Amino acid sequence: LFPPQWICCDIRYLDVSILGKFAVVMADPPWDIYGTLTDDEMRRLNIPVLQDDGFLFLWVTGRAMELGRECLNLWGYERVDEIIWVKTNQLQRIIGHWLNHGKEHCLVGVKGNPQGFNQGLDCDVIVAEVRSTSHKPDEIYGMIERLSPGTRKIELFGRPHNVQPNWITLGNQLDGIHLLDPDVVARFKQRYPDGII
Amino acid sequence: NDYCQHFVDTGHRPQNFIRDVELIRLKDELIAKSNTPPMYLQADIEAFDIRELTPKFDVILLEPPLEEYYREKCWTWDDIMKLEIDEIAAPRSFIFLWCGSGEGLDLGRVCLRKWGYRRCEDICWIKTNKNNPTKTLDPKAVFQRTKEHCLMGIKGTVDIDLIITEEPEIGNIEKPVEIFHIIEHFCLGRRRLHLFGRDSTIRPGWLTVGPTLTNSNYNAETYASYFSAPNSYLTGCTEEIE
Ligand SMILES: O=C(NC[C@]1(O)CCCN(c2cc(NCc3ccccc3)ncn2)C1)c1ccc(CN2CC3(CCC3)[C@H]2C2CC2)cc1
Numbered sequence: 001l002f003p004p005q006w007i008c009c010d011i012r013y014l015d016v017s018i019l020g021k022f023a024v025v026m027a028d029p030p031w032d033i034y035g036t037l038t039d040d041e042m043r044r045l046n047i048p049v050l051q052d053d054g055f056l057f058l059w060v061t062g063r064a065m066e067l068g069r070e071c072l073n074l075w076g077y078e079r080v081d082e083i084i085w086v087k088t089n090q091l092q093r094i095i096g097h098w099l100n101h102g103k104e105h106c107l108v109g110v111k112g113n114p115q116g117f118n119q120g121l122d123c124d125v126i127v128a129e130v131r132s133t134s135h136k137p138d139e140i141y142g143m144i145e146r147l148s149p150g151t152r153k154i155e156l157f158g159r160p161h162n163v164q165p166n167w168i169t170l171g172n173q174l175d176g177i178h179l180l181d182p183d184v185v186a187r188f189k190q191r192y193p194d195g196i197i
Numbered sequence: 198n199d200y201c202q203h204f205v206d207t208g209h210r211p212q213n214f215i216r217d218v219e220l221i222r223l224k225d226e227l228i229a230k231s232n233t234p235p236m237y238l239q240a241d242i243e244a245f246d247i248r249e250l251t252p253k254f255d256v257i258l259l260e261p262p263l264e265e266y267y268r269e270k271c272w273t274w275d276d277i278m279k280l281e282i283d284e285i286a287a288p289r290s291f292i293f294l295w296c297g298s299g300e301g302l303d304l305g306r307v308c309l310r311k312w313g314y315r316r317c318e319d320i321c322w323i324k325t326n327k328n329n330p331t332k333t334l335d336p337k338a339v340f341q342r343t344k345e346h347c348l349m350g351i352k353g354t355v356d357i358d359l360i361i362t363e364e365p366e367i368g369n370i371e372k373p374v375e376i377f378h379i380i381e382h383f384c385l386g387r388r389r390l391h392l393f394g395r396d397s398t399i400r401p402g403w404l405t406v407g408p409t410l411t412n413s414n415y416n417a418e419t420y421a422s423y424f425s426a427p428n429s430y431l432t433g434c435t436e437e438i439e
Contacts, residue, residue, distance in 0.1 A: 055339065065319060066306060080337040082302055084321055084344065086359065092216040098349065098383065099318045099358040108339050120334045123341035124298075125323055127200045127211035139201045146205065147339065 001180035004163035008174040009197050011156055012037065016046050018187035019168060023114070023151030024144055025050050026057040028136060030157060031064035035172070039067060047075040050154060053112030057083070057144065059136065060105050062096065068107055077109030085126040085137055095130055106140070114148075121146045135161065152181075208330035210343050212323045218361040221382070224434060228381050231433045232402030233423040238415035241408045242392065243276065250406065251417050252424060253287040255386025258376070258403075260295045260393045266370045268333065270408070272393075274304035280392075282312040289353030291385050293320075295372060298342040299335055305348050314350030321346055322373055324364035347376055356382055371397065384434035388424060402433065 007014065025047065030036045037045075047056070056077050060068035072079055083106040087095040094102045108124075121143075128137035141164050144153065155162055158169035168184075177195065179185050200211035259282070261272040282292070292314050296305035309316055322345045332341045343364075360375045377400060380389075391398060394405035396412075404420065427438045 065316065069303060069306070078337075079303055081339045081342075082298075082346075083340065084323075086212065086215065086323065088215065092214055094215065094218070094357060094359065096318060096358070099320070099356055099379070102357045102359045103321060105319070110337070110339070117339075119339050120332075120341055121205055122201050123204055123210055123332075123343045125210060125212050125343050127215060139199055142199060143201050143340075 001182070002165050003180060004165055004167060004169070004178070005180055005184075006158070006160075006163050006169040006171070006174045006178050008172060008176055009170055010172055011045065011170050012041060014170065014197050015191055016170075017049050018191045019050070019154065019184060020152070020187075021052055021054075022050055022154045022168075023054045023148045024057065024153040025054070025156070026059075026140070026144070026153070027156040028059040028134075028158070029064075031061070031067065033062040033064055042067070042071050043074055045071070045075075045156075047071075051111050053114045054110075054151075055114060055117075055148070056107075056109035056111065057140070058107040058109065060107055065105060072107060072109045075109075075111075077111045079107050080110045081108035081124055082106070083108060083124050083126060083140070083143075085128060085140075087130050088127055090129055092127070104136075106136075117148050118146055135159075141167075208326075210324075210326050210330075212343065212361060213325045213327050213330075215361060221355050224355075224382065224384075227434050227436065228384075228402070231387060231431060231435065231437055233387060233420075235399050235401050235403060235405070236415050236420055237394075237399050237405040237410055238413045239408065239410035240406050242280070242406065247281050247285055249417070250285050250390065250404075252388055252421050253290070254285055254390040254404075255287055255290050255388045256380060256390070257282065257286060257290065257292045258380065258389070258391045258394075259292060260372060260391065262370060262393060263297045263301060265297050265299055265301075265335070267368065269367045274301060274308075278304065278308050278311060280308075282308075285390070286312065286352060287386075287388065290351075291380075291383070292348075292350040292352075293376065293380055294348045294350065296346045296348055298345050299337075302346055305346075309348060309350040312350075312352075314352045316348050317351050318349040318358055319346055320349060320358045320360065320376070320379065322360045322362070322376075325361060326364050328363060345372075347372075377403075381433065384432040387428075387431055387433040389433075 264271040
């Protein structure tokens with residue numbers, strides 16, 4: 001079901017096995033560098049059930065630059081790329097205690113044998129204006145769409161602005177449960193007959 | 198304006214459109230005044246006992262020639278990881294490690310931990326292509342690689358983390374001289390080592406060691422003399438002591 005879908009929930013306790021497999025997973029987790037997850041909770045997240053072949057996009061900062069690599073590898077991925085977003089203002093000028101930070105990082109992991117992807121279409125630098133606090137740039141969805149067009153995708157720890165066609169968004173600040181894919185709707189009713197998690 | 202779409206359309210990398218890419222010039226003068234004379238040594242570092250380099254360094258810049266630098270003797274991460282960097286670093290010291298853009302972003306972190314550092318900054322050399330708007334991808338690459346990372350590590354107790362310059366010519370392996378400004382502005386100390394530097398990177402305030410150097414002037418005791426008292430603990434950002 002192409003139009004946006006989402007599930008308000010605590011990603012720790014939701015049974016993600018009901019959602020099927022995704023060509024792309026993206027996550028912007030609350031690392032314990034305000035709703036944080038501990039390193040063990042992050043390690044235990046059931047990312048491995050979500051894909052057999054495809055890509056993982058994992059936003060990282062501070063010590064999660066290292067801890068995100070750990071989770072990525074533990075979850076069964078190999079880091080094959082790292083996107084950086086150069087944060088600019090409206091005049092295309094650039095906006096960790098040793099250096100000032102002009103950028104945010106997003107690791108790119110591959111799992112299995114993905115085929116039918118358009119590798120090489122985008123480059124690994126994003127230049128885009130800062131919207132809000134902790135808001136990631138919308139350009140990442142265009143890059144992800146060109147890499148794997150039309151496929152089903154899932155975002156963990158998304159916010160309401162992050163919902164997108166072809167994406168299912170999980171996050172604890174979304175407004176309720178909105179699901180349209182019939183295979184998912186079935187497995188959700190079966191696993192959650194009273195609609196609570 | 199979607200600059201990722203614009204790059205897909207035109208071949209112009211998004212960094213091409215960053216614009217602009219009071220008086221921190223006294224600091225520079227003080228750096229220039231306290232700088233030791235340049236010193237340098239031709240050495241084949243695989244065959245070379247690293248302990249011969251004394252004293253222990255406050256700052257180590259490490260720039261191994263990765264195979265990926267030669268797109269059109271290279272060092273693998275295997276070779277690099279077996280370097281005994283911990284034996285020549287001062288107990289409180291810093292490292293800056295050029296990691297390229299591939300597996301080095303992972304293996305370079307292994308090296309930093311192996312030698313006793315933790316990463317405190319990730320510095321990105323972002324390469325524009327204003328003067329030539331295609332790249333031959335590493336097989337594992339999902340995206341076109343238009344940057345390189347220099348990891349900063351610390352062991353023991355003004356600038357941004359971006360360098361933007363135009364992508365050098367095919368087979369030019371030089372890194373932007375701006376990395377030296379960033380390092381020197383940190384005021385980390387005056388014992389500064391550049392491993393795998395070249396004739397073209399020799400620089401005041403630095404000891405350069407590499408296989409392609411054509412001349413040497415390194416002497417252990419002469420080099421130590423620059424840091425004997427009353428100069429042992431200078432940041433390299435203060436006046437020389439009278
Ligand atoms: O606010 C956030 N994201 C929505 C939540 O929804 C909110 C609330 C907790 N969060 C959860 C947490 C959860 N379970 C644990 C729990 C439940 C209830 C109480 C306490 C703890 N389940 C579902 N969402 C996320 C958020 C916070 C920080 C950042 C960092 N960014 C910004 C950055 C810049 C480019 C992108 C990136 C960065 C590179 C590293 C991003 C998003």
